[PDB]
Design a protein around this ligand. Structure first.
Ligand SMILES: CC[C@H]1OC(=O)[C@H](C)[C@@H](OC(=O)N2CCC[C@@H]2c2cccnc2)[C@H](C)[C@@H](O[C@@H]2O[C@H](C)C[C@H](N(C)C)[C@H]2O)[C@](C)(OC)C[C@@H](C)C(=O)[C@H](C)[C@H]2NC(=O)O[C@@]21C
Ligand SMILES: [Mg+2]
Ligand SMILES: [Mg+2]
Ligand SMILES: [Mg+2]
Ligand SMILES: [Mg+2]
Ligand SMILES: [Mg+2]
Ligand SMILES: [Mg+2]
Ligand SMILES: [Mg+2]
Ligand SMILES: [Mg+2]
Ligand SMILES: [Mg+2]
Ligand SMILES: [Mg+2]
Ligand SMILES: [Mg+2]
Lengths: 58, 240
RNA sequence: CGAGCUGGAGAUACGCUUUGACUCGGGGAUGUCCGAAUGGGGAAACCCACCUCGUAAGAGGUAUCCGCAAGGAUGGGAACUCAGGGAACUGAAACAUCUCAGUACCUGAAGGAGAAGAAAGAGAAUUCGAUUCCGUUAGUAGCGGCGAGCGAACCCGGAU
RNA sequence: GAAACGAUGACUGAAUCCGCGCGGACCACCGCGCAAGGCUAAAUACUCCCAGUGACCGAUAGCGCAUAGUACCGUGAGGG
RNA sequence: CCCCCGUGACAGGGGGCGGAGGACCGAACCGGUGCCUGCUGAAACAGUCUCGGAUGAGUUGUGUUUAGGAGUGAAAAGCU
RNA sequence: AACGAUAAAAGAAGUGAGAAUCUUCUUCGCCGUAAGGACAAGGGUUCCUGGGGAAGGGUCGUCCGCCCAGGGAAAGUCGGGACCUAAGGUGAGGCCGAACGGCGCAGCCGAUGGACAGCAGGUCAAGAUUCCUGCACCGAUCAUGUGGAGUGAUGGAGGGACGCAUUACGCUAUCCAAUGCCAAGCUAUGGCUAUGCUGGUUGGUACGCUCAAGGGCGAUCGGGUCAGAAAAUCUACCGGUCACAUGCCUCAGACGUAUCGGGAGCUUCCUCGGAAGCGAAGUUGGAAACGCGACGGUGCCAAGAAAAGCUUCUAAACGUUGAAACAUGAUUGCCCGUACCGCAAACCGACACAGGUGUCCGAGUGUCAAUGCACUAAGGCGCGCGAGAGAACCCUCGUUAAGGAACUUUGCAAUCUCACCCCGUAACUUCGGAAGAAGGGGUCCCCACGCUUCGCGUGGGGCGCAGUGAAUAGGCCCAGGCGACUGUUUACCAAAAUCACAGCACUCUGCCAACACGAACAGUGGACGUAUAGGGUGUGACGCCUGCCCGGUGCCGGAAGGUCAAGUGGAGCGGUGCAAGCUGCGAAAUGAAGCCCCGGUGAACGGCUAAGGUAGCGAAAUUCCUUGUCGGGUAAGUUCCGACCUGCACGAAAGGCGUAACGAUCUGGGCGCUGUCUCAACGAGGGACUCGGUGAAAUU
């Protein structure tokens, strides 16, 4: 058949313990020096399209 | 080659393989042969040509009658193109003449012999077969059949002068499987190569044999397969 | 019947109905093509014809088996009925006669039922008085590798 | 089986009322009955269908279906 | 079949010319040899590579026939 | 875990709530005897348009083969039917059978076959040999004239009408070349300025004192009835007269003139892109079919459907006053099929599945050839998750020092070899073979000279490590077993030494054959055959051969006798009634095939008590003891070869021994080469790891 197979159901406890590292880390959001919508460090502000001057359209 | 019929292959009867084996073949056509000849009594015919005939073994002769009716006859050993052939009681002991046994001299060699006046030729038809006449008894004539058997055939029955054609089926050595295929399917399948289910020589561990019998029950080397029939009275001396 | 109706349909538009719609009860009239299928063919519901009447449309006929002819038969029915044919698993703690069982199944014929029926009988009283069915006799009498097991009928009571 | 009687595939084959068949081999006596022509209602059986009822079910029950012999499966019979 | 050379018991040998074969190599096509891969597959039997046949006892379409102790079988109790 | 082939993908622009994924543009890459194109089967609206965006789509969708609505499919000539027949199916009458049913002559059904009238273009969003434009053809009914007398079946004949291989001449579709023609422009990086570059370069029909290979043919008179049921003016047969070359008849195709068409492109409008209008050239040379001429030629054995249409005859019938045939007008033109997918994401495979599916077309360059191989036209496509990373390990690859089988059950695997030309080639042989044996050499470019080309030969010269410069592309040899050989087999673990085979033998079978299927005195196969044939059984090319035993068993044969069934025959014993009678059982003798009994029989079952192995083989696909013993080869040899004979337990058609050739067969050795190995390394791609999307399983 399907050669190595689990021997016993993994308990609600054991299953959950394994998920103690699955939690997403929230982005470190910065506020744009211009358009004043929040942005990602080292990226162009989505809203105004600025990164010192304006690079992207809108 | 002149005004014939279509011979269609078939080895099974009502559905089932009834004559074991039998298959391949070069798709042959049927040539109608005048085996009786009675109705052409008195009329002379010219040997137009000796044609090839699959379905036989005996070469075929094309007869060109004076009345312009064309017929086919088993070509006897010797008959050449441009010779005359006559049917009826009035006939010389020359090649290819059809004449009843009473008019046939003793010690004469014949082929295409009947059995009942009419019906058509029934004995010594395949190439090189001969019927040696022994001498009359009453209405009946004692004749030597290709097997060696002596039969009481009534003189009322026709015969043809001489031995059958196609000289000898000897230099015909077939050669390879497949020559046999130009004719009949994968021949003799040994019952010893069979399984217990299939045939009595079936099974065992290796090459063998143990009681000697055919496909179905019976026995095979020696067993009188002839019945307690009436045709026996009209027969004197059989074996060999 | 007596005011609603326009099918389920949960749907709008057009309408119909006290000169009695709708619905219900009872008759008729139309009933394409296939199917016994029946003009002939066919891979059901489609191809292809001929004959008679006819203004074309359109209508009628054209299968075999019975008999003079009128008129009858083919085909379909859940189960029930009789008939022709008729298993084995199974029981016998094996198996072969026996049992399962004349059961299951196939086939034929038919009807609302059929079957059977008017004593060359049952039978032991010189009683009975067509048949079928029910109770009973009775697991008696008997049959039986006298084993497993199988099993009446007469009398009597009763439906008719 | 001591196997009567019915029944019939093969062969045979009678009597005609001082006659024929039966009565559990068979005989005699006693007794019951007239085959070799046909029909014949009612009582009996069954339930596709219809009505009524129920110490029947109430959605895994009850019919396979609160409706479907559908969807689905199978070349098909069939299964569902 | 046509030109050439041979004679001790011999057979033929040579040139042209023809175009035979269950002949050869090899695609298509039929096939399945060896390895690996695939092994809850891409796939209820496959893939790449290698390999057998390749004018024959060849391969293939339609149409039709034979089945259940029955059929079919260049014979494995194979296939139905 | 996976997201279904390792044929890629990139950017721009667009759309939209939303875009790796939808549209468009420019590139890139993969197929191109297909991964293009046209049918058939099969599927069923999947087609086109406009919308949609639950679910289906292995991700996402604004999109789709999914969902909704509307539309689309056009035939006298193409397939099928109103025509024909094959296998087979059915089948009045008929032949059989418990039933149900099974067979069966004609006839009828039945294409996979025969027969039969149309081509060139145009273009819907989606059909086209169907619609439309142009110019044809087929049959039917009638009309008007020609014409002036037959017309000719349900039957006759001819004819339709048939193989495989090979091959001569001519052509076409079609393809190539060019400083042929025609058309458009421009090119510049260094040059060319066009003799460069790109593209196009003829389809149908009518006529023509034009060319033309090839291909098909006798015409008449008469005689015999005994031939075609009869008749025949038709056909066969026999005879007579002109049958050499020729002679007639036919033009595949070419050429020319005309004409309708198409034609590269250009021209205007533009509602985001299509519609409309116009139109040049048409050369010379080369190649060339599996198609056409055609039913050609030759060779061969295994000896190559039928029926209708058709052409010719008379019979009967109507008519010889309005015949048939022709010509030109009109009229007429039924039914089903036609979209789309159709080597596939629309069919079969439960899936948008790496399989399977019959036919046709299938361009160019190079390469002896080719449908091979590489690249590439036209056309189609990048395979419905994606993006990083650059671990172990696993898959598919490239290279590898020194060694070269030491690996191991085994060179398993993987290299080497590799095409064409020239030289050269063994034992052994069935004189064919073995053979591509083995081995060695050449191969590219330019020039000059020669010839038989697409090309080749000789000379000299050039370049590179290298010249079938990349792809396709035999490793070879020695000895053995087994089987002669090609072939066949276990769909899905066995391809073989299995089966088959040509050949040999025994044997049965005389024809309503044996034998076989079957309810059956049916019917049919055997066989429209006939002992030079058919059934069965065995052995298994060819060569030399095949011994001994007939007691047992079986088969064929004899019969002095013994044994034996029903039946014929009834001697006797017994029941009952008073009695004739009616009844229960019953010997002897006679009564069949069989069996016991006698002889035969081995390419009958068998044996080596009925006899104890003739040749030949032998430690063998057979041998236990066993790794027998001696020799070979190896440094070393349980295997292998050879001898020997002590054959546990070879041996003559369950064939014995041998045999050239053949083998994806099995065993042993050698050369070559090599990552099999000492002993592993590096490198590549695809997984594995990481992120975002979707998200199974056995097990418990
Ligand atoms: C390839 C997948 C295929 O497996 C195989 O074929 C292998 C090779 C086969 O091995 C084999 O059959 N064999 C035959 C001997 C060599 C090989 C084997 C055996 C054991 C381990 N590995 C290999 C098994 C291991 C074998 O089991 C074995 O059976 C033996 C009878 C006993 C063993 N026991 C003792 C553990 C068992 O494992 C069985 C019988 O199968 C066929 C197992 C059963 C459960 C089965 O049918 C599966 C569903 C099977 N069918 C399928 O489609 O998938 C499977 C899993
Ligand atoms: Mg509930
Ligand atoms: Mg219902
Ligand atoms: Mg190869
Ligand atoms: Mg080979
Ligand atoms: Mg028939
Ligand atoms: Mg990736
Ligand atoms: Mg990092
Ligand atoms: Mg040896
Ligand atoms: Mg072999
Ligand atoms: Mg082979
Ligand atoms: Mg993830």
């Amino acid at each position: 058949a399907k050669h190595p197979v689990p021997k016993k159901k993994t308990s609600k406890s054991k299953r959950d313990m394994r998920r103690s590292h699955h939690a997403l880390t929230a982005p470190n959001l910065t506020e744009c020096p211009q358009c004043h919508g929040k942005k990602l460090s080292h990226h162009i502000c989505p809203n105004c399209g600025y990164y010192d001057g304006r690079q992207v359209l809108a | 080659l002149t005004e014939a019929l279509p011979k269609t292959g078939g080895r099974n009867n009502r559905g089932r393989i009834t004559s074991r084996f039998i298959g391949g073949g070069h798709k042959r056509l049927y040539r109608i042969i005048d085996f009786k000849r009675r109705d052409k009594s008195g009329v002379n015919a010219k040997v137009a040509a000796i044609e090839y005939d699959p379905n036989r073994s005996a070469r075929i002769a094309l007869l060109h009658y004076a009345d312009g009716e064309k017929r086919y006859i088993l070509a006897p050993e010797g008959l050449t193109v441009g010779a005359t052939v006559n049917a009826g009681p009035e006939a010389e002991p020359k090649l290819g003449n059809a004449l009843p046994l009473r008019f046939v001299p003793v010690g004469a060699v014949v082929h295409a012999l009947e059995l009942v006046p009419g019906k058509g030729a029934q004995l010594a038809r395949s190439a090189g077969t001969s019927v040696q006449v022994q001498g009359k008894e009453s209405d009946y004539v004692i004749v030597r059949l290709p097997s060696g058997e002596l039969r009481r055939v009534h003189s009322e029955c026709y015969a043809t002068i001489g031995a059958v054609g196609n000289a000898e089926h000897k230099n015909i050595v077939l050669g390879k499987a497949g020559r046999s295929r130009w004719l009949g399917r994968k021949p003799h399948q040994r019952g010893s190569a069979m399984n217990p289910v299939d045939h009595p020589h079936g099974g065992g561990e290796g090459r063998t044999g143990a009681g000697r019998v055919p496909v179905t029950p019976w026995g095979k080397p020696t067993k009188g397969l002839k019945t307690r029939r009436k045709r026996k009275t009209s027969d004197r001396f059989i074996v060999t």
